[PDB]
Design a protein around this ligand. Structure first.
Ligand code: GL8
Ligand code: GL8
Ligand SMILES: *[C@@H]1O[C@H](CO)[C@@H](O[C@@H]2O[C@H](CO)[C@@H](O)[C@H](O)[C@H]2NC(C)=O)[C@H](O)[C@H]1NC(C)=O
Ligand SMILES: *[C@@H]1O[C@H](CO)[C@@H](O[C@@H]2O[C@H](CO)[C@@H](O)[C@H](O)[C@H]2NC(C)=O)[C@H](O)[C@H]1NC(C)=O
Ligand code: NAG
Ligand code: NAG
Ligand code: NAG
Ligand code: NAG
Lengths: 529, 529
């Protein structure tokens, strides 16, 4: 039977799912690690023990324990990111969509969800892999990993909570895909890992980590890169946050062993209730438990690894969205609200920059403000709002990715860069937020192909070409069918294309002006002062 | 006789001069101080002792001793600034052009020449006051003052070379004009002092100095302001330069008395031959002997005087030229030459910024470079050349004047601001230099009215309206005839007009973007680092 597959871990039985008036097979909720519960909370994952019998993989698995957004109860723009299954620490499962009839050896794509390292689920409607698997004939896998304290609490030097275990969950799932995907018809020699925001940073982290490199062939990074300022902390800051979490829960803080044992007796929700209390600054776009530069998963600093070429050399395809910062200003900066145009006063602009670059002294804050203020028209509300949107997006997503791409390209085997700037016709968020962080995903997963979702015909065509670029790149290392050509991004030319409903345009040096400020000048400034 | 005038210092006999097919009287070379020679070199000026008999004022006086430009021997663009009379330390004289028939009590304008405080003459063809005096019926005076070491060598605490004596020469001439101009038909209650570059800085210095304020009514500042970074030094730097000058001449340096006595035995040319050797840095737009912040002529720092309103409150008219920096890049920055288009490489650009902001550390130099570089096109020769031209002009002339005008306007009684951007049709300098520092003067003095000078009819009309704005402002405190109106510059609106052959346009906040960088951000940066 097409729905029965035997893997090195045991037999698995899938389910047939309808897709665009056709059908494909789905194997949902395949376990790839032992549940990380009880004394295993905070520990590195252990491989799933093989099972006899047939594992029922007909339904989505639980989602990992996480902070649930309740800012706009029932609003679809925000609930589309919230867990849609029950949450459980028993959440280490993967999902596979397989074309029908089963391929023999085809292109594999493995999705790594984002969520700021503190949230996320592989089961969201926006990550439904049936459209992509069906339309491009690829075996599509979505993995899962622990987020928040459960995946990233770090007490470096302790083997009970070493940090980075969420990244190790991802690696374990990639090892399982490497060892078993051939049974589902996937070609393990051709696995492309792809992810957005924290998922895109994770993808770049596996490109860097010696221990992950061999598990995949090629990589796609959407609005995220490993060097993002919010994506990792030092072992001292990780330790400090872990100690502060224990302090919020009245834990004995005398030793790592005491702290961890106390943290392990708390119910999941007790940790999540105080998670946000451990941030060191009043800030925006900063999350509590994230990857740690440990000297193990990451042998040295990310910058020295990038500079010395200490990373997997292969082809990468990556890019950013036009207004990466809006989501974060809406949720925490003064002056922004969901139901108004959010024109920002000069004062709220200034308090917004302070929240945006929490690690900056006053000279640094003045430098940012001068860089983004039109002084011939400093009280312009739209300009202050949009300028702050650019500050947040440039500092947190765009310039870190441009720095990653110029460093990578020096040693890599091929880079394709995009700038996604299409505002979906059916977006439920306000106009002022523009092309929001995360809103290219629905195009990558082919949602515009389903009529009931209300996209335009040009949006369906945009989705079809993005999926075909993504799969052709996964298959060959080049998004172009051997029609308008997406040129290679090179060190000298730095070309990239716009991704939207208009005829392809090629440009060069994506936001160079602002990124020289964020990547070269500001750090020199903060370091000197 | 119309050419005979009796003054409190004695009788003076002038000469009749032809002007635009008419005639006026000129009283040239009237002494206003005792020759500052021998033991009087470096000392404050002494008033001219009255004389019996008739002083022959029919011919131009000698020019003060100064460094003579020999970069382009015989080239008119540069020789028009060089002394055109013999040089002598006996050079403290003033010139007066008087309408014919002699007015009874008319508007007086007193010109203070520029020359970086190290050169300049009241007798240059470009400062011929007959056209302005004739066309606008004003009594036009040009004074003179010691420049270079002779006017500004400063050993604060010594009464033999206290510094600022060149400014005291100007003040003495203003005192003479106040006490005697009524005999020439001028109204001493209505004297407007006007000057360009170092002359415009000098004008702002008399507006600030308690001891000069009462000697005039109103002021015009062209491309110069008192707070220019090149226009003054501290008493410690003045002392250091004075000591270094003595060191270049093998002087005994044991005491001020020893140093001064040695400097007084040197011929004028011996001091000038080593003058440039005392600058502290490799720089551009910095001159050896300039005004000193002494606690006497200037009671406290210029900034605190500006901030507290410690200055004459009256009406001022002032402005800048479009390419103030070109003259200085031509003369010393690498890559610039008189006979080429001077497209500048990225490297020469960087060495140009280092020369331009000599007092800056590396972080400061990076800030300037990032502020003026188009990073999407950093190897563009024209852009690098023009960007450096703007850096030099903004740092040395434009932003210091904008800072002066916004501070002044808070306490003053009326401000009119202009931006002069007409490139004269007969300019002999290359096209790349644009609207050069000093090239609005010929329009202010009405040179375009003389046909043989080859200006266009629209340039003659531009000259006529500038002279009429200048004289009407001198007469009433408002350049407008009680036709298009030059609006008042106010703290809130900051309006200014373009001055050129096109129909008047009004704009606001002259180069605000760049001047926030030069006046607020960079100094905070240099102060913190
Ligand atoms: C760096 O990429 C991300 C960080 C957070 C998220 C995402 C990210 O990518 C986004 C697109 C996709 O990858 C998945 C999740 C998204 C969208 C959904 N959501 C939840 C709704 C938006 C939240 C914005 C952050 C504000 C967060 N926030 C709190 O909710 C909060 C509660 C209490 C104290 C402090 C805070 C706080 O600062 C969060
Ligand atoms: C701040 O306004 C000025 C500073 C200098 C001058 C003027 C200024 O206003 C200009 C217009 C008007 O007011 C009068 C003079 C002008 C034009 C005529 N000129 C002479 C020719 C241009 C000189 C440019 C400065 C380079 C100077 N220079 C030397 O010549 C030199 C010799 C030896 C060592 C070092 C140097 C050096 O640095 C000099
Ligand atoms: C990616 O790597 C391949 C293989 O190493 C490169 O192809 C080689 O290109 C050189 C030219 O410099 C040829 O001499 C070799 O014969 C090629 N090898 C093969 C097997 O084709 C390719 O140029 C690289 N691509 C990029 C974008 O760097
Ligand atoms: C310059 O000063 C004059 C005189 O001090 C100002 O005129 C006065 O304006 C006030 C209005 O605030 C009137 O109440 C007075 O009666 C005016 N005095 C006279 C004698 O006219 C004038 O406003 C000032 N101009 C500027 C541009 O500041
Ligand atoms: C698999 O699980 C689903 C839902 O839990 C159930 O309805 C289905 O019948 C199961 N299949 C088998 C054979 O266990
Ligand atoms: C599509 O449009 C209909 C009618 O305009 C609306 O009621 C419906 O909720 C929309 N459906 C979705 C899934 O966006
Ligand atoms: C004034 O001086 C000039 C030139 O030195 C001379 O030609 C003229 O005759 C003099 N006038 C008198 C009366 O001294
Ligand atoms: C004016 O033009 C003539 C002929 O073009 C030229 O020879 C002369 O030198 C110019 N005169 C001046 C003073 O510029």
């Amino acid at each position: 039977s097409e729905l029965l597959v035997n893997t090195k871990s045991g037999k698995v039985m899938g389910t047939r799912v309808p897709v665009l008036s056709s059908h494909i097979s789905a194997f949902l909720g395949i376990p790839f690690a032992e549940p990380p519960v009880g004394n295993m909370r905070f520990r590195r994952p252990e491989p799933k023990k093989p099972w006899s019998g047939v594992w029922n993989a007909s339904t989505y698995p639980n989602n990992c324990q996480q902070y649930v957004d309740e800012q706009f109860p029932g609003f679809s723009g925000s609930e589309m990111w919230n867990p849609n299954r029950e949450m459980s620490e028993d959440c280490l499962y993967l999902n596979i969509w397989v074309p029908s009839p089963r391929p023999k050896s085809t292109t594999v794509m493995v999705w790594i969800y984002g969520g700021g390292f503190y949230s996320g689920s592989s089961t969201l409607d926006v990550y439904n892999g049936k459209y992509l698997a069906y339309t491009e004939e690829v075996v599509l896998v979505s993995l899962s990993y622990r987020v928040g304290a459960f995946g990233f609490l770090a007490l470096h030097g302790s083997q009970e909570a070493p940090g980075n275990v969420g990244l190790l969950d991802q690696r374990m799932a990639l090892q399982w895909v490497h060892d078993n995907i051939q049974f589902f018809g996937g070609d393990p020699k051709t696995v492309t890992i792809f992810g957005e925001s924290a998922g895109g940073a994770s993808v770049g982290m596996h490109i860097l980590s010696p221990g992950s490199r061999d598990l995949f062939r090629r990589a796609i990074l959407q609005s995220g890169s490993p060097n993002c300022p919010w994506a990792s902390v030092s072992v001292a800051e990780g330790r400090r946050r872990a100690v502060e979490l224990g302090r919020n829960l009245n834990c004995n803080l005398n030793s790592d062993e005491e702290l961890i044992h106390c943290l392990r007796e708390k119910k999941p929700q007790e940790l999540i209730d105080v998670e946000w209390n451990v941030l060191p600054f009043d800030s925006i776009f900063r999350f509590s438990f994230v990857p740690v530069i440990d000297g193990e998963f990451f042998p040295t600093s990310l910058e020295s690894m990038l500079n010395s070429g200490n990373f997997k050399k292969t082809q990468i395809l990556l890019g950013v969205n036009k207004d990466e910062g809006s989501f974060f200003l809406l949720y925490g900066a003064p002056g922004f609200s969901k139901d108004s145009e959010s024109k920002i006063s000069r004062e709220d602009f200034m308090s917004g920059v302070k929240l945006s670059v929490p690690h900056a002294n006053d000279l640094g804050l003045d430098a940012v403000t001068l860089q983004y203020t039109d002084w011939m028209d400093d009280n312009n509300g739209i300009k202050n709002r949009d300028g702050l949107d650019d500050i947040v997006g440039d500092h947190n997503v765009i310039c870190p990715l441009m720095h990653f791409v110029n460093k990578y390209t020096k040693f890599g085997n091929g880079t394709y860069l995009y700038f996604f700037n299409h505002r979906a016709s059916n977006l439920v968020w306000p106009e002022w937020m523009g092309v929001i962080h995360g809103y290219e995903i629905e195009f990558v997963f082919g949602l515009p192909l389903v009529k009931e979702l209300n996209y335009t015909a040009e949006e369906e065509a945009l989705s079809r070409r993005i999926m075909h670029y993504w799969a052709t790149f996964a298959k060959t290392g080049n998004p172009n069918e051997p029609e308008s050509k997406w040129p290679l991004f090179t060190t000298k030319e730095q070309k990239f294309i716009d991704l939207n409903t208009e005829p392809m345009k090629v440009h060069q040096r994506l936001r160079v002006q602002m990124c020289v400020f964020w990547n070269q000048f500001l750090p020199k400034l903060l370091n000197a002062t």
